[PDB]
Design an enzyme around this catalytic site. Structure first.
Site, PDB file in Angstrom:
ATOM      1  N   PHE C 117      -4.766  21.050  10.428  1.00  0.00           N
ATOM      2  CA  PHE C 117      -4.810  22.413   9.780  1.00  0.00           C
ATOM      3  C   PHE C 117      -4.305  22.295   8.298  1.00  0.00           C
ATOM      4  CE2 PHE C 117      -7.338  25.569  11.974  1.00  0.00           C
ATOM      5  CZ  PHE C 117      -7.329  24.909  13.324  1.00  0.00           C
ATOM      6  N   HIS C 233     -10.108  32.996   2.337  1.00  0.00           N
ATOM      7  CA  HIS C 233     -10.365  31.995   3.188  1.00  0.00           C
ATOM      8  C   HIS C 233     -12.016  31.606   3.130  1.00  0.00           C
ATOM      9  CE1 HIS C 233     -10.064  30.234   7.356  1.00  0.00           C
ATOM     10  NE2 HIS C 233     -11.383  29.917   7.231  1.00  0.00           N
ATOM     11  N   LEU C 243     -13.136  36.408  10.186  1.00  0.00           N
ATOM     12  CA  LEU C 243     -12.805  35.037  10.204  1.00  0.00           C
ATOM     13  C   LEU C 243     -13.305  33.975  10.922  1.00  0.00           C
ATOM     14  CD1 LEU C 243     -11.278  32.849   8.764  1.00  0.00           C
ATOM     15  CD2 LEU C 243      -9.630  33.070  10.230  1.00  0.00           C
ATOM     16  N   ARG C 288      -8.796  23.970   0.149  1.00  0.00           N
ATOM     17  CA  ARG C 288      -9.520  25.280   0.370  1.00  0.00           C
ATOM     18  C   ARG C 288      -9.931  25.898  -0.969  1.00  0.00           C
ATOM     19  NH1 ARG C 288      -5.874  28.399   3.207  1.00  0.00           N
ATOM     20  NH2 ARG C 288      -4.238  28.249   1.468  1.00  0.00           N
ATOM     21  N   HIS C 356      -7.743  37.021   2.708  1.00  0.00           N
ATOM     22  CA  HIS C 356      -7.064  36.716   3.991  1.00  0.00           C
ATOM     23  C   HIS C 356      -5.890  36.879   4.341  1.00  0.00           C
ATOM     24  CE1 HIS C 356      -6.524  34.693   7.528  1.00  0.00           C
ATOM     25  NE2 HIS C 356      -6.052  33.547   6.894  1.00  0.00           N
ATOM     26  N   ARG C 391      -0.355  29.067   0.722  1.00  0.00           N
ATOM     27  CA  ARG C 391       0.347  28.956   1.897  1.00  0.00           C
ATOM     28  C   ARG C 391      -0.680  27.672   2.474  1.00  0.00           C
ATOM     29  NH1 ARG C 391      -1.179  30.330   7.222  1.00  0.00           N
ATOM     30  NH2 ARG C 391      -3.180  31.461   6.473  1.00  0.00           N
TER      31      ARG C 391
HETATM   32  C1  FAD Z   1      -7.840  36.747  11.165  1.00  0.00           C
HETATM   33  C2  FAD Z   1      -6.704  36.159  10.785  1.00  0.00           C
HETATM   34  C3  FAD Z   1      -6.263  34.717  11.464  1.00  0.00           C
HETATM   35  C4  FAD Z   1      -5.045  34.278  11.024  1.00  0.00           C
HETATM   36  N1  FAD Z   1      -4.887  33.027  11.398  1.00  0.00           N
HETATM   37  C5  FAD Z   1      -3.683  32.277  11.340  1.00  0.00           C
HETATM   38  C6  FAD Z   1      -3.567  31.019  12.058  1.00  0.00           C
HETATM   39  O1  FAD Z   1      -4.354  30.643  12.736  1.00  0.00           O
HETATM   40  N2  FAD Z   1      -2.316  30.375  11.630  1.00  0.00           N
HETATM   41  C7  FAD Z   1      -1.427  30.615  11.021  1.00  0.00           C
HETATM   42  O2  FAD Z   1      -0.354  30.078  10.513  1.00  0.00           O
HETATM   43  N3  FAD Z   1      -1.583  31.976  10.420  1.00  0.00           N
HETATM   44  C8  FAD Z   1      -2.638  32.715  10.461  1.00  0.00           C
HETATM   45  N4  FAD Z   1      -3.050  34.088   9.913  1.00  0.00           N
HETATM   46  C9  FAD Z   1      -1.841  34.711   9.053  1.00  0.00           C
HETATM   47  C10 FAD Z   1      -0.703  35.274   9.970  1.00  0.00           C
HETATM   48  O3  FAD Z   1      -1.426  35.351  11.119  1.00  0.00           O
HETATM   49  C11 FAD Z   1      -0.179  36.506   9.569  1.00  0.00           C
HETATM   50  O4  FAD Z   1       0.384  35.962   8.230  1.00  0.00           O
HETATM   51  C12 FAD Z   1       1.130  36.945  10.527  1.00  0.00           C
HETATM   52  O5  FAD Z   1       0.414  37.093  11.768  1.00  0.00           O
HETATM   53  C13 FAD Z   1       1.723  38.173  10.073  1.00  0.00           C
HETATM   54  O6  FAD Z   1       2.636  38.554  11.173  1.00  0.00           O
HETATM   55  P1  FAD Z   1       3.533  39.689  10.890  1.00  0.00           P
HETATM   56  O7  FAD Z   1       4.672  39.559  11.904  1.00  0.00           O
HETATM   57  O8  FAD Z   1       4.170  39.685   9.689  1.00  0.00           O
HETATM   58  O9  FAD Z   1       3.227  41.160  11.234  1.00  0.00           O
HETATM   59  P2  FAD Z   1       1.736  41.805  11.813  1.00  0.00           P
HETATM   60  O10 FAD Z   1       1.109  41.019  12.817  1.00  0.00           O
HETATM   61  O11 FAD Z   1       0.828  41.846  10.520  1.00  0.00           O
HETATM   62  O12 FAD Z   1       2.502  43.081  12.419  1.00  0.00           O
HETATM   63  C14 FAD Z   1       2.780  44.245  11.644  1.00  0.00           C
HETATM   64  C15 FAD Z   1       3.623  45.206  12.264  1.00  0.00           C
HETATM   65  O13 FAD Z   1       4.071  46.242  11.309  1.00  0.00           O
HETATM   66  C16 FAD Z   1       3.797  47.358  12.041  1.00  0.00           C
HETATM   67  N5  FAD Z   1       3.765  48.712  10.836  1.00  0.00           N
HETATM   68  C17 FAD Z   1       2.894  48.228   9.718  1.00  0.00           C
HETATM   69  N6  FAD Z   1       3.324  49.569   8.842  1.00  0.00           N
HETATM   70  C18 FAD Z   1       4.107  50.287   9.705  1.00  0.00           C
HETATM   71  C19 FAD Z   1       4.538  51.529   9.342  1.00  0.00           C
HETATM   72  N7  FAD Z   1       4.500  52.078   8.224  1.00  0.00           N
HETATM   73  N8  FAD Z   1       5.361  52.128  10.278  1.00  0.00           N
HETATM   74  C20 FAD Z   1       5.523  51.572  11.674  1.00  0.00           C
HETATM   75  N9  FAD Z   1       5.016  50.235  11.892  1.00  0.00           N
HETATM   76  C21 FAD Z   1       4.414  49.681  10.950  1.00  0.00           C
HETATM   77  C22 FAD Z   1       2.528  47.262  12.608  1.00  0.00           C
HETATM   78  O14 FAD Z   1       2.099  48.129  13.600  1.00  0.00           O
HETATM   79  C23 FAD Z   1       2.741  45.996  13.276  1.00  0.00           C
HETATM   80  O15 FAD Z   1       3.167  45.970  14.436  1.00  0.00           O
HETATM   81  C24 FAD Z   1      -4.153  34.904  10.146  1.00  0.00           C
HETATM   82  C25 FAD Z   1      -4.619  36.083   9.616  1.00  0.00           C
HETATM   83  C26 FAD Z   1      -5.562  36.520   9.801  1.00  0.00           C
HETATM   84  C27 FAD Z   1      -5.931  38.094   9.438  1.00  0.00           C
HETATM   85  O1  OAA Z   2      -8.035  30.338   9.713  1.00  0.00           O
HETATM   86  C1  OAA Z   2      -7.616  29.522  10.242  1.00  0.00           C
HETATM   87  O2  OAA Z   2      -8.234  29.117  11.453  1.00  0.00           O
HETATM   88  C2  OAA Z   2      -6.620  28.717   9.513  1.00  0.00           C
HETATM   89  C3  OAA Z   2      -6.158  28.942   8.302  1.00  0.00           C
HETATM   90  O3  OAA Z   2      -6.425  28.517   7.121  1.00  0.00           O
HETATM   91  C4  OAA Z   2      -4.865  30.217   8.562  1.00  0.00           C
HETATM   92  O4  OAA Z   2      -3.807  29.438   8.807  1.00  0.00           O
HETATM   93  O5  OAA Z   2      -5.095  31.265   8.603  1.00  0.00           O
END
Ligand code: FAD
Ligand code: OAA
Ligand code: HQO
Ligand code: SF4
Ligand code: F3S
Ligand code: FES
Ligand code: K
Lengths: 130, 243, 577, 119
Positions: C117, C233, C243, C288, C356, C391
């Site tokens: 990836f 993306h 996605l 990308r 994304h 990223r």
């Molecule tokens: C469809 C998709 C697929 C992805 N796939 C990949 C992948 O395959 N590999 C990878 O490396 N990355 C991937 N990413 C990126 C990565 O997943 C995200 O960057 C990451 O999951 C974010 O996690 P996080 O812990 O920061 O918070 P989040 O999971 O975004 O959670 C945020 C938390 O904060 C809380 N919150 C927000 N505002 C408030 C508030 N005002 N009061 C109280 N609570 C609040 C929410 O309820 C939640 O619990 C993907 C992103 C998306 C959108």
């Molecule tokens: O979208 C995916 O499957 C992989 C990617 O670029 C991410 O890390 O978000």
């Protein structure tokens, strides 16, 4: 004090009449009745069998009714519906892996029906050809 | 062109005003792509800003979406208006107390899920020694049961839960079974008391509707039957241990 | 307000927040940890990730190769000391997740498998089928259930943090079901709120990724770093923006135009590769940015297919075969069937580039701490300086557990040596939050929050997308400023107390506007092209390490203005060239 | 919230019986109802297969005694178990229902046992 007022919908004794999936479930458990009724019948026959030919003939007379013949035909239907649904459900109790894959239910459903078929034939042979 | 419209019935309820839930009706534009979740946003944006409901992912993976659509538990983001041209009535997820509009109290679900200790127990391995070894064959034992998104549609489908709100329910037992069946866990005994309760697997009469509605095909019913088998093995073992 | 005492308060229960909560419970068994989230933990956006999470694992790999991948992928805007610490702790955290149960996909011998990836030369992305986020998030959530130190405040909407004399002292949150305000006192607060992709019309994010946490930091003088770098993306579904994992192409999927042409060969990513064997770096597995840019170029030439949901190109996967599809792409298939009505076995999937991931975020030092003592930020809401201007695929999820653990530990220490603060000052802060909230509630003006929402989204799409021009960026800055004025004329016509979402979406919208202005201003000033930030104007179309090898810092003053400052990039062993 | 130390249920005993009974009446009940409930009373059998003398000869054999018992009894422990729960599903309050349905099963089982050691 809270401003929340949680509304709990009630569940009626007729819940199952709604959805067909529930109805079919009720129907499935309903097979329980003709099944015990048949067990009772066998007990009559068993004790008529012991009270001599005179009593046994009175049992056979009962089975001839012929309203009792209908009830028994209903009983046979119910029993088959039980077999049909029992066999589909039984396989779920087993968790079997065949080469990195969780199998069934088809392999098991097929075996049970195979065994019933053979059993139905062996019993009929045994009870009628001699 | 010209989008068709659909009169949707939504069962509203405001605990600060209403004494009981009551229907409302809204005209919503739509096409072959429009989902219930899309419709609810349109309503909140242009017809009734006080319409509350849970949602997030928009792709049937987060599980916050569950509600009743013509009496069938479904995910609003995976339900499409094109399938309801002869009528669509939306209500709060069944068998859960209604708090406000389409939002219900999920506390029992959460507590139920918490009560079965859904975590790896008793494995002393530490990070520096590397990961556990587990083969496809070992994973297959529980894999399907790990796809649960805690959406609660199985609790709405289960008539046993509606008759016995103390029943820990389909998802919770499936979750417990998922850890019991994982070759890396060693805490089956920490979970059995709850699965052996009357409010455990034994409150299940195998209606099987839960499995029928799982948007993720987890088959919680199969998990429960299998649990019954284990609960029964457990009962014998206990009966034979005069130790 | 009812008050609650905690050693540390964590805002956000996604990957990062949860990993932070557990670290904190394991670092201090006696601690009282307040885990807060506006949705139940398992509904956080982490649940949606499908590709995987990076960690050196194969024998022929090296921490140095992952190090170099990350730094080059970020176009040299990565804090090289942070990157080093990162790669070095990924293995530990992926393994630990495995110990906690995460069902990573395996090799026949039971070792965990790994796939490629982010264009990495050596595959090192660990994965749970194509549900990795789902499995990591749940594993994390479920594992945390065993620590009594963690007390959760589910569906609690944090309104603001409490700061006095340069130190954080807690926060005010709203119990969503009750509609009541609550005060949580703690000497350390970890911001783990997620990114801001929802300021974009079309994105891959969940409705809750609104940038709240970032907005709260802005309010207290903390700047947001590198906000101009928004990752698109290349393959999302028209309209929904959903996605379609890069995994569709690593499995041999192709992208074609209306002529059925594999257009990517004419944009420097040729020669074409046979359907059979796709090669990394080439065609559909090209850089990308070049793949997303090819779309725009195809669009100019009139080679995109027009559909009711918009112009797209086709992601053709048929030649993959049932077995493969269902064994490595089960999710992608059901999404495709459900939302675009297409079977990836029978027809091609319509797709197009989609907003994304948020690279920029709350500025933090190497321990996730911000300029306000006791206040930390980890995860997508932050900027530890790991991603630079772009990223690397599968680095975000790794980041969540690697720095979430660091954050939890460092916050734990920080709260133990904090010492007391001025109580009247603190309480005054809380009364402040409450007053501002009444002010917003009593605001009238007849403006509909949702239309402001829609316009913000359109502006970010037009002005801060794949290709940027000073005319259109400026147009977006002008739009947001206008939308900020309108935001003050919004009326929240719902005054109920039980799960009032009208009010919450309106607050969320407030943070968005603020967050989006830092992005637009940051982008308008970066008179260069680097990573996700690409400009078409003369003297800006290239990378400029002489004048812009620095981070953008965006502050928001009390007068509503967005000011920029610049900081240097820590280099260690890989100078730019 | 949820009892931290619930009482182990005794359902595994009735469930087990009901399981074996449900499997026995699935495989063997259809044919038996055919013979007894239909073929016998309709003369639909060759010669004297189902005549008093032949049935008695069968019922008095060991294998016949075991068979008649199980054919009568396993189905009972299955059906009564289901009617017991049907009561709950139908929301019909039945005092000491567990003693009623299972007792009836035990009573009938004994009665049957007496029967096959012969009256
Ligand atoms: C469809 C998709 C697929 C992805 N796939 C990949 C992948 O395959 N590999 C990878 O490396 N990355 C991937 N990413 C990126 C990565 O997943 C995200 O960057 C990451 O999951 C974010 O996690 P996080 O812990 O920061 O918070 P989040 O999971 O975004 O959670 C945020 C938390 O904060 C809380 N919150 C927000 N505002 C408030 C508030 N005002 N009061 C109280 N609570 C609040 C929410 O309820 C939640 O619990 C993907 C992103 C998306 C959108
Ligand atoms: O979208 C995916 O499957 C992989 C990617 O670029 C991410 O890390 O978000
Ligand atoms: C090993 C085969 C077990 C299959 C049994 C079918 C499942 C099943 C079906 C029922 O109708 C029930 C009604 C009440 C109580 C339990 C029930 N169980 O377990
Ligand atoms: S089993 Fe299926 S229905 Fe039940 S909560 Fe889990 S995902 Fe939802
Ligand atoms: S519907 Fe309910 S009765 Fe058991 S099979 Fe599913 S938990
Ligand atoms: S919005 Fe996530 S399950 Fe529907
Ligand atoms: K970020």
């Amino acid at each position: 004090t809270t401003k929340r007022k949680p509304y709990v919908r009630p569940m009626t004794s007729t819940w199952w009449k709604k959805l067909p999936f529930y109805r079919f479930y009720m129907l499935r458990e309903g097979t329980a009745v003709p099944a015990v009724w048949f067990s009772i019948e066998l007990i009559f026959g068993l004790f008529a069998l012991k009270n001599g030919p005179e009593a046994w003939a009175g049992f056979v007379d009962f089975l001839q009714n012929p309203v009792i013949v209908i009830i028994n035909l209903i009983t046979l239907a119910a029993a088959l519906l039980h077999t049909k649904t029992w066999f589909e459900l039984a396989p779920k109790a087993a968790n079997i892996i065949v080469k990195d894959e969780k199998m069934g239910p088809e392999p098991i459903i097929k075996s049970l029906w195979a065994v019933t078929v053979v059993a139905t034939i062996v019993i009929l042979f045994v009870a009628l050809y001699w | 062109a010209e989008m068709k419209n659909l009169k949707i019935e939504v069962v509203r309820y405001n605990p600060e005003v209403d004494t009981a839930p009551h229907s409302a009706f809204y005209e919503v534009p739509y096409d072959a792509t429009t989902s219930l979740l899309d419709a609810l946003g349109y309503i909140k944006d242009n017809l009734a800003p006080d319409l509350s409901y849970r949602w997030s992912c928009r792709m049937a993976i987060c599980g916050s979406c569950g509600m009743m659509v013509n009496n069938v538990p479904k995910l609003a983001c995976k339900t499409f208006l094109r399938d309801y041209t002869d009528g669509m009535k939306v209500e709060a997820l069944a068998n859960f107390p209604i708090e406000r509009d389409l939002v219900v109290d999920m506390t029992h679900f959460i507590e139920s899920l918490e009560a079965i200790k859904p975590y790896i127990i008793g494995n002393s391995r530490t990070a520096d020694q590397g990961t556990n070894i587990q083969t496809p064959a070992q994973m297959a034992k529980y894999h399907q049961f790990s796809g649960c998104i805690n959406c609660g549609l199985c609790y709405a489908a289960c008539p046993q839960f509606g008759l016995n709100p103390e029943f820990i329910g389909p998802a919770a037992i499936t979750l417990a079974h998922r850890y019991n069946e994982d070759s890396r866990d060693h805490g089956k005994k920490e979970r059995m008391a709850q699965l052996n309760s009357q409010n455990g697997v034994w409150s299940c009469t195998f209606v099987g509707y839960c499995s029928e509605v799982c948007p993720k095909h987890v088959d919680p019913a199969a998990a429960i039957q299998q649990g019954k088998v284990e609960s029964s093995k457990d009962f014998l073992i206990a009966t034979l241990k005069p130790r | 307000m009812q008050t609650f005492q905690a050693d540390l308060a964590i805002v956000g229960a996604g990957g990062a927040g949860l990993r932070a909560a557990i670290a904190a419970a394991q670092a201090n068994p006696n601690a009282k940890i307040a885990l807060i989230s506006k949705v139940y933990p398992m509904r956080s956006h982490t649940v949606a990730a499908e590709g995987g999470s990076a960690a050196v694992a194969q024998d022929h790999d090296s921490f140095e190769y992952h190090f170099h991948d990350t730094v080059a992928g970020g176009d040299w805007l990565c804090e090289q000391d942070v990157v080093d610490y990162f790669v070095h702790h990924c293995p530990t955290e992926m393994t630990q997740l495995e110990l906690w149960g995460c069902p990573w996909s395996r090799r026949p011998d039971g070792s965990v498998n790994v796939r490629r990836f982010g264009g990495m030369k050596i595959e090192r992305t660990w994965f749970a089928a194509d549900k990795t986020g789902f499995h990591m998030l749940h594993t994390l959530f479920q594992t945390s259930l065993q620590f009594p130190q963690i007390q959760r405040f589910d569906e609690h909407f944090v309104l603001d943090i409490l700061v006095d004399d340069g130190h954080v002292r807690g926060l005010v949150a709203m119990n969503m079901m009750e509609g009541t305000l609550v005060q949580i006192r703690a000497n350390a607060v970890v911001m783990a709120t997620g990114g801001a992709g929802r300021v974009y019309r079309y994105n891959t994010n969940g409705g809750i990724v609104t940038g709240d946490g970032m907005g709260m930091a802005l309010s207290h003088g903390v700047p947001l770093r590198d906000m101009e770098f928004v990752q698109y993306h290349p393959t999302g579904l028209p309209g929904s923006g959903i996605l379609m994992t890069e995994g569709c192409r690593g499995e041999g999927g192709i992208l074609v135009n209306k002529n059925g042409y594999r257009y990517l060969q004419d944009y420097g990513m040729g020669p074409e590769t046979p359907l059979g064997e796709p090669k990394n770096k080439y065609m559909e597995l090209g850089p990308r940015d070049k793949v997303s840019q090819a779309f725009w170029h195809e669009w100019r030439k009139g080679n995109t297919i027009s559909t009711p949901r918009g112009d797209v190109v086709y992601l053709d996967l048929r030649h993959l075969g049932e077995k493969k599809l269902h064994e490595r792409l089960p999710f992608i298939c059901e999404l495709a069937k459900a939302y675009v009505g297409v079977d990836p076995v029978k027809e091609p999937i319509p797709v197009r580039p989609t907003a994304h991931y948020t690279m920029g975020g709350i500025e933090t030092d190497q321990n996730c701490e911000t300029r306000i003592k006791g206040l930390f930020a980890v995860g997508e809401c932050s900027s530890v300086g790991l991603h630079g201007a772009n990223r690397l695929g599968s680095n975000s999820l790794a980041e969540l557990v690697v720095f979430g653990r660091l954050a939890g530990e460092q916050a734990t220490e920080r709260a133990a040596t904090a010492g007391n603060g001025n109580e009247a000052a603190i309480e005054a802060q809380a009364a402040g939050v409450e007053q501002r909230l009444k002010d917003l509630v009593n605001q009238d003006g007849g403006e509909n929050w949702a239309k402001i929402r829609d316009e913000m989204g359109l502006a970010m799409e037009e002005g801060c997308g794949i290709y940027r021009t000073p005319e259109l960026m400026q147009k977006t800055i002008d739009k947001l400023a206008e939308l900020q004025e309108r935001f003050k004329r919004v009326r929240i016509t719902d005054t109920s107390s039980v799960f009032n979402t009208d009010l919450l979406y309106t607050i969320e919208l407030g943070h968005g506007l603020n967050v989006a202005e830092c992005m637009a201003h940051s982008a308008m000033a970066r008179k260069e092209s680097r990573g996700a930030h690409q400009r078409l104007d003369e003297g800006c179309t290239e990378r400029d390490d002489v004048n812009f090898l620095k981070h953008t810092l965006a502050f928001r003053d009390a007068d509503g203005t967005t000011r920029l400052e610049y900081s240097d990039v820590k280099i260690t062993t890989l100078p730019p060239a | 919230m949820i009892n931290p130390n619930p009482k182990r249920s005794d359902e595994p005993v009735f469930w087990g019986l009901f399981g074996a009974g449900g499997m026995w009446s699935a495989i063997i009940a259809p044919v038996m109802i055919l013979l007894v409930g239909i073929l016998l009373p309709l003369g639909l059998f060759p010669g004297d297969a189902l005549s008093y003398e032949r049935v008695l000869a069968f019922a008095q054999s060991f294998i016949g005694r075991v068979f008649l018992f199980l054919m009568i009894v396993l189905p009972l422990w299955c059906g009564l178990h289901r009617m017991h729960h049907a009561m709950h599903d139908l929301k019909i309050h039945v005092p000491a229902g567990k003693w009623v349905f299972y007792g009836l099963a035990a009573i009938l089982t004994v009665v049957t046992l007496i029967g096959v050691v012969t009256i």
